[PDB]
DNA sequence: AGCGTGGGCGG
DNA sequence: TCCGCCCACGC
């Protein structure tokens, strides 16, 4: 934790300067990536990939049990579990 | 469910 | 640094 968070509001402390360099934006209210489609500004980009499916439809992630498709990773890894009950 | 959004991290 | 994942938590 050599990078901590100037910002005297804040107590962070990141391992890595690419971390803080991205943390700062939350401050800054700094929001680098526009949605074509809907003009939304986001934070960051791979948050904008995802966003972006929301318009298309497309759905990458298919669960392995009932093949149930999601836009995200995360989103289809929370659904396998209901398999179990 | 649908999906915003920050942290850790590898490349 | 950027990129683009996983991961996690929020409403
Ligand atoms: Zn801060
Ligand atoms: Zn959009
Ligand atoms: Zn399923």
């Given at each position: 934790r050599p990078y901590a968070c100037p910002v005297e509001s804040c107590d962070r402390r990141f391992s890595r300067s690419a971390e803080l360099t991205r943390h700062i934006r939350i401050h800054t209210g700094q929001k680098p990536f526009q949605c074509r489609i809907c003009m939304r500004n986001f934070s960051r980009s791979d948050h904008l990939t995802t966003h972006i499916r929301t318009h298309?439809?497309?759905?990458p992630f298919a669960c392995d049990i009932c093949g149930r498709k999601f836009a995200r990773s995360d989103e289809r890894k929370r659904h396998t579990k209901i398999h179990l009950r």
């Open positions: 298309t439809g497309e759905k």
